[PDB]
Write a protein that binds this ligand. Structure first.
Ligand SMILES: C[S@@+](CC[C@H](N)C(=O)[O-])C[C@H]1O[C@@H](n2cnc3c(N)ncnc32)[C@H](O)[C@@H]1O
Ligand SMILES: C[S@@+](CC[C@H](N)C(=O)[O-])C[C@H]1O[C@@H](n2cnc3c(N)ncnc32)[C@H](O)[C@@H]1O
Ligand SMILES: C[S@@+](CC[C@H](N)C(=O)[O-])C[C@H]1O[C@@H](n2cnc3c(N)ncnc32)[C@H](O)[C@@H]1O
Ligand SMILES: C[S@@+](CC[C@H](N)C(=O)[O-])C[C@H]1O[C@@H](n2cnc3c(N)ncnc32)[C@H](O)[C@@H]1O
Ligand SMILES: *Cc1c(COP(=O)(O)O)cnc(C)c1O
Ligand SMILES: *Cc1c(COP(=O)(O)O)cnc(C)c1O
Lengths: 444, 428
């Protein structure tokens, strides 16, 4: 009855390799120690032409029918084809606004066809929801199959844990979060705490919590939620399919994604590539990966001609989730960027904050990581690589509501060594009709 | 404009042969007698199309990419602002918000299998105000583009309304002004209008000093005011009710619980459900519960008095018509409810905590049955109220037990210690 299936496979598998694993297998790496990927049965999917898939996926966008209302699960056949609908844990994720940045594109970039994907408008406020619905759904299934998974554990700065904990909580799955004691107080770990996660405050840095969550997982029947998981990528790749669908199956010229551990940027390529390969569309977009100057291993690797990649030491950024020294999905990203003929650009602490301020002025509320992405767009316009007329999509990874402090400090002119050129502080005036009118007429 | 549909400003009531009405193109805030204004649609022009027509029309637009019908508000454009040009609309894909099924929360805490929470907080600016602001700003945009004298939009909100207002205005290139007392200025509270390029004024006076001053400016400069009295924002807000129906495949819930501070909201929801009933989409409206804080005004005391002793009359009318109920929630009760809800996956606002407390109390009274289809409206994303959650979960709210707090446990970087803590948790 159900002809579609998926399995684990070594990332970029060698010719005629026989290595595969059932998705029910709890595995994170291959025989060689490399990363795993979800490989779908392309022979079975190709029994249906692009016309069928377009019509099928279109018939399901924003409908009440479970589970196809979700931006991810409307594409179930391409994500987890063999999961039962009873096991799916979904919070209506995806269907995210592809915001037309008319005033930003025209006033700053000379662009008419610039769009911003607001992935931040989600259940936990970041794109990580797309990935967590797939992972927790699969974990949910394993639990019901009486498999040894008593909960999910992770150690990541808010964004990953918030998504995980929320989805785990709704399904009654215990969620275990390891976080450094002083390094984050209680402000940014509010979501997992509120979502009934079992939170531990450890006497170490972020690195020490990452090491300890491994040790725990080695003995305890606790599933490990990491950058490694190819399941998360299966949900995240639907954002690329969604962008296509929102453009009525027309392919944009450029897509710019913030790259931390570099999984997301790869997920986007896989989504775009899958639509081309199955006959939905005839082409794929060119991709741009944007990084913070304080954490630019991919940037240094690209401009060296895809030769010599080095795990650099990352320094403090306002774009917290993007500051990664040794990116886990590095080989994935490099592969993706080569195939789609892509580009990598960096962004300084000042440049990412300024581009963020300029975006907000157009009626947005986007994260510092998005500022990084917009900086890349700024620079590629300068270099003439992105044309003023080209259909360009910038991916906003998180809502600004999760990164308010960086905005409060910027407009308060309270960041040391920062120029804060686009700050918009409140103006002081005494209760006088003439004085109030004059400052308003000057703004008029 | 071969458009059969139309709407106008009309007083809320005035039975004895009133002919008072204003064009939606006029700047007006109140009636001749000072009462509330109301957007009245040409129901006779709408009644020309049967219940099935509107259902199928609204269903065909939902989620789609066709401008402007993708929005949860503008998908019902004919019922909101029928005369505005598509090229004048300022939309940020608002509405379409998750009708989250509270399975774990409903079954474990309330013994309810069909309880839903409507997450309006998942939107552009983090609240349901986006629904109302898209209509207001669109009209203001329409007026400005036809060379009408409107220099900008102003308000005195420190929270949701100003955040929503300034965001929509910024995209349309419409100046946004926030009049506020210099002492009540908060950098955190105003983070959204500040970033959205809104002209925020800090005035060296009190609450009354500002309201007196705005009167003096709006008599000289034509600044459109956004406030609680505004009836144009209700036209957007009402589509949330319509949406709830559409999301249930045009099946009416038994109960819809709305937080009530402003009191305009509960009316908007009533207005939306009623419009669907009156036009043949459905055969009924839900019973509604208005949930108020214990600290809040005497709407609760008025309901308990058997309807004998802003937007107060507006809400009382809506509640009497739909056979509604009002309940209170105390500071501790709403915080507890927020914690319980949150622990099951949600991340809701304190206003939603108030609504859930009203649900709890009415379940205990046996007014709401276990099987009853119940929708609890969440007005704002929990991310706008992290400080109260931080305080609650660290037991840092005085005169409150914080009984459902989930503080993190302290451990050193020792394997055996981390394990023993984990073992006792997994043993539970
Ligand atoms: C209210 S349910 C319809 C009633 C349901 N079929 C029943 O029998 O109880 C449909 C709504 O659930 C919410 N929802 C959340 N996740 C969804 C998903 N993955 N697929 C479809 N709807 C989802 C959406 O807001 C959607 O409008
Ligand atoms: C994106 S507009 C482009 C307008 C103009 N040709 C330009 O380039 O500046 C193209 C079509 O999309 C629709 N549209 C207008 N504003 C939109 C928005 N903010 N988001 C999505 N679609 C929009 C309109 O129906 C219009 O016909
Ligand atoms: C990408 S535009 C369609 C292209 C457009 N016809 C053009 O030629 O430029 C459609 C997307 O804009 C966004 N959007 C925001 N508001 C919308 C609205 N009111 N109606 C339709 N789409 C809207 C949604 O994310 C939607 O998927
Ligand atoms: C409300 S669910 C299950 C109700 C069940 N009779 C009970 O009381 O436990 C009814 C239908 O809605 C769909 N559904 C399941 N989970 C959903 C969710 N989280 N959101 C929206 N619809 C859902 C499924 O297709 C299911 O058959
Ligand atoms: C995790 C995260 C990123 C980084 O994505 P990768 O796939 O790890 O490159 C960027 N922005 C936000 C908001 C994130 O949470
Ligand atoms: C929410 C609301 C208000 C109050 O908004 P705040 O900015 O939070 O004070 C007033 N009137 C109506 C109709 C509302 O919906």
């Amino acid at each position: 009855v159900n002809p579609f299936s998926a399995k684990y496979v070594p990332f970029n598998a060698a010719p005629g390799s026989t290595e595969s694993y059932s998705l029910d297998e709890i595995v994170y790496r291959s025989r060689s120690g490399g990363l795993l990927d979800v490989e779908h049965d392309m022979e079975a999917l190709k029994r249906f032409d692009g016309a069928y898939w377009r019509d099928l996926f279109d018939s399901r966008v924003g409908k009440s029918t479970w589970p196809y209302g979700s931006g991810v699960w409307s594409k179930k056949e391409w994500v987890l084809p063999e999961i039962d609908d009873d096991d799916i844990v979904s919070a209506f994720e995806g269907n995210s606004n592809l915001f037309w940045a008319e005033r930003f594109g025209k006033q700053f970039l000379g662009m008419n066809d610039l769009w911003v994907k607001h992935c931040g408008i989600s259940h936990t406020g970041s794109f990580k929801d797309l990935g967590m619905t797939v992972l927790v759904s699969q974990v949910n299934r394993l639990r019901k199959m009486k498999r040894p998974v008593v909960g999910v554990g992770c150690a990541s700065t808010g964004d990953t844990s918030a998504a995980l904990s929320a989805y785990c909580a709704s399904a009654g799955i215990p969620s275990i979060v390891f976080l450094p004691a002083n390094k984050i107080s209680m402000a940014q770990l509010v979501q997992p705490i509120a979502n009934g996660a079992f939170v531990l405050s450890i006497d170490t840095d972020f690195d020490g919590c990452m090491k300890l969550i491994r040790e725990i997982t080695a003995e305890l029947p606790i599933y490990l939620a990491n950058s490694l998981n190819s399941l998360r990528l299966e949900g995240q790749k639907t954002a690329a399919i969604e962008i296509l669908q929102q453009f009525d199956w027309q392919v944009p010229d450029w897509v710019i994604v913030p790259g931390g551990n570099l999984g997301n940027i790869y997920a986007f390529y896989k989504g775009f590539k899958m639509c081309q390969e199955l006959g939905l569309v005839d082409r794929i977009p060119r991709m741009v990966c944007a990084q913070a100057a304080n954490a630019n291993p991919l940037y240094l690797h690209y401009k060296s001609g895809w030769k010599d990649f080095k795990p650099m030491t990352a320094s403090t950024t306002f774009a917290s989730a993007i500051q990664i020294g040794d990116p886990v999905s590095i080989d994935r990203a490099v592969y993706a960027l080569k195939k789609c003929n892509g580009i990598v650009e960096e962004a300084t602490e000042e440049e990412l904050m300024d581009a963020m301020a300029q975006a907000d002025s157009t009626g947005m509320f986007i994260c510092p990581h998005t500022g990084v992405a917009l900086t890349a767009l700024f620079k590629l316009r300068n270099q003439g690589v992105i044309a003023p007329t080209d259909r360009t999509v910038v991916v906003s990874t998180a809502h600004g509501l999760k990164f308010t402090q960086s905005k409060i400090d910027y407009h308060s002119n309270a960041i040391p060594d920062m120029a804060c050129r686009f700050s918009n502080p409140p103006v002081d005036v005494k209760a006088d009709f003439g004085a109030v009118m004059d400052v308003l007429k000057s703004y008029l």
